[PDB]
Amino acid sequence: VNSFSGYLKLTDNVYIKNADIVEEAKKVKPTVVVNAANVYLKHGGGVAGALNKATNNAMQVESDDYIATNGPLKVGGSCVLSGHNLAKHCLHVVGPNVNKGEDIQLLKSAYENFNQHEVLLAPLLSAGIFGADPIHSLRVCVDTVRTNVYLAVFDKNLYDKLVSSFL
Ligand SMILES: O=C(O)C(=O)Nc1ccccc1
């Protein structure tokens, strides 16, 4: 049994809810929240900007030190950093950004990072300002992630479209 409430069950392991991931993280304090990161961990907008704002910029300070030591992530890659006031840990995952011309086949690689964690609160990778089709992102998630994932979709129309169209 876990703390997650109000989710629709899509599969054995994937759950979905219309929710603000920031507000959901603050309520649940999950072991892992996933960030929709870029390779530079520059948390300017979208999910990343919202998560970072909720940490009062502490996520960005920590991220800048990580990049100064390790250099940029790979598209499709990830790193584990603090969850600050939102979660125990933040898994920063880089999905391909279609608005930069990145290979959408890298979306499966991105979701494979989730399999290193038994339970996660996450957004749909490469959705929103990353430019991918969220329907496609949900299909790759279901067909790639084997651990227990609680998805938060930001829009109410979008959520309803993802559920209605789910095979
Ligand atoms: O990825 C999401 O969770 C999301 O809601 N994307 C979105 C938001 C606003 C307009 C279109 C897509």
PDB file of N, CA and C and ligand atoms in Angstrom, residues 19 47 123-124 126-129 134 152-156 158-159 162, ligand 1:
ATOM      1  N   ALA A  19      -3.284  16.422 -12.097  1.00  0.00           N
ATOM      2  CA  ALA A  19      -2.697  17.067 -10.916  1.00  0.00           C
ATOM      3  C   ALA A  19      -1.469  17.870 -11.298  1.00  0.00           C
ATOM      4  N   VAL A  47       7.730  21.779 -16.383  1.00  0.00           N
ATOM      5  CA  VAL A  47       7.779  21.071 -15.101  1.00  0.00           C
ATOM      6  C   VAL A  47       9.050  21.496 -14.327  1.00  0.00           C
ATOM      7  N   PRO A 123       6.081  13.223 -14.446  1.00  0.00           N
ATOM      8  CA  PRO A 123       5.344  13.769 -15.574  1.00  0.00           C
ATOM      9  C   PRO A 123       5.553  12.869 -16.774  1.00  0.00           C
ATOM     10  N   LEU A 124       4.759  13.074 -17.803  1.00  0.00           N
ATOM     11  CA  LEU A 124       5.001  12.453 -19.088  1.00  0.00           C
ATOM     12  C   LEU A 124       6.235  13.033 -19.763  1.00  0.00           C
ATOM     13  N   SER A 126       8.991  14.257 -22.307  1.00  0.00           N
ATOM     14  CA  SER A 126       9.006  14.898 -23.628  1.00  0.00           C
ATOM     15  C   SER A 126       7.661  15.560 -23.959  1.00  0.00           C
ATOM     16  N   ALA A 127       6.712  15.618 -23.040  1.00  0.00           N
ATOM     17  CA  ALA A 127       5.438  16.332 -23.275  1.00  0.00           C
ATOM     18  C   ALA A 127       5.634  17.820 -22.978  1.00  0.00           C
ATOM     19  N   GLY A 128       4.530  18.560 -23.093  1.00  0.00           N
ATOM     20  CA  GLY A 128       4.569  20.005 -22.825  1.00  0.00           C
ATOM     21  C   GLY A 128       5.559  20.675 -23.732  1.00  0.00           C
ATOM     22  N   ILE A 129       6.392  21.556 -23.180  1.00  0.00           N
ATOM     23  CA  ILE A 129       7.325  22.390 -23.982  1.00  0.00           C
ATOM     24  C   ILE A 129       8.424  21.563 -24.631  1.00  0.00           C
ATOM     25  N   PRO A 134       1.920  13.769 -26.277  1.00  0.00           N
ATOM     26  CA  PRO A 134       1.746  13.111 -24.979  1.00  0.00           C
ATOM     27  C   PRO A 134       1.100  11.723 -25.041  1.00  0.00           C
ATOM     28  N   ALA A 152       1.443  12.436 -13.400  1.00  0.00           N
ATOM     29  CA  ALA A 152       0.712  13.716 -13.240  1.00  0.00           C
ATOM     30  C   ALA A 152       0.712  14.480 -14.577  1.00  0.00           C
ATOM     31  N   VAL A 153      -0.460  14.620 -15.209  1.00  0.00           N
ATOM     32  CA  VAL A 153      -0.588  15.408 -16.477  1.00  0.00           C
ATOM     33  C   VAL A 153      -1.115  16.790 -16.078  1.00  0.00           C
ATOM     34  N   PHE A 154      -0.469  17.863 -16.552  1.00  0.00           N
ATOM     35  CA  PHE A 154      -0.829  19.244 -16.125  1.00  0.00           C
ATOM     36  C   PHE A 154      -2.202  19.734 -16.629  1.00  0.00           C
ATOM     37  N   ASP A 155      -2.608  19.402 -17.859  1.00  0.00           N
ATOM     38  CA  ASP A 155      -3.899  19.971 -18.347  1.00  0.00           C
ATOM     39  C   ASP A 155      -5.108  19.059 -18.046  1.00  0.00           C
ATOM     40  N   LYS A 156      -6.318  19.623 -17.897  1.00  0.00           N
ATOM     41  CA  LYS A 156      -7.547  18.824 -17.598  1.00  0.00           C
ATOM     42  C   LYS A 156      -8.135  18.250 -18.894  1.00  0.00           C
ATOM     43  N   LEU A 158      -6.288  17.524 -21.630  1.00  0.00           N
ATOM     44  CA  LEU A 158      -5.201  16.555 -21.942  1.00  0.00           C
ATOM     45  C   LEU A 158      -5.387  15.250 -21.167  1.00  0.00           C
ATOM     46  N   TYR A 159      -5.467  15.360 -19.850  1.00  0.00           N
ATOM     47  CA  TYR A 159      -5.736  14.175 -18.991  1.00  0.00           C
ATOM     48  C   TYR A 159      -6.905  13.347 -19.553  1.00  0.00           C
ATOM     49  N   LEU A 162      -5.976  11.649 -22.769  1.00  0.00           N
ATOM     50  CA  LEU A 162      -5.052  10.485 -22.532  1.00  0.00           C
ATOM     51  C   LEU A 162      -5.850   9.247 -22.051  1.00  0.00           C
TER      52      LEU A 162
HETATM   53  O1  LIG B   1       2.743  17.227 -20.179  1.00  0.00           O
HETATM   54  C1  LIG B   1       1.804  17.624 -19.453  1.00  0.00           C
HETATM   55  O2  LIG B   1       1.681  17.118 -18.321  1.00  0.00           O
HETATM   56  C2  LIG B   1       0.879  18.734 -19.987  1.00  0.00           C
HETATM   57  O3  LIG B   1      -0.093  19.105 -19.446  1.00  0.00           O
HETATM   58  N1  LIG B   1       1.230  19.313 -21.245  1.00  0.00           N
HETATM   59  C3  LIG B   1       0.476  20.379 -21.850  1.00  0.00           C
HETATM   60  C4  LIG B   1       0.122  21.512 -21.127  1.00  0.00           C
HETATM   61  C5  LIG B   1      -0.548  22.563 -21.721  1.00  0.00           C
HETATM   62  C6  LIG B   1      -0.874  22.509 -23.063  1.00  0.00           C
HETATM   63  C7  LIG B   1      -0.538  21.396 -23.774  1.00  0.00           C
HETATM   64  C8  LIG B   1       0.151  20.344 -23.183  1.00  0.00           C
END
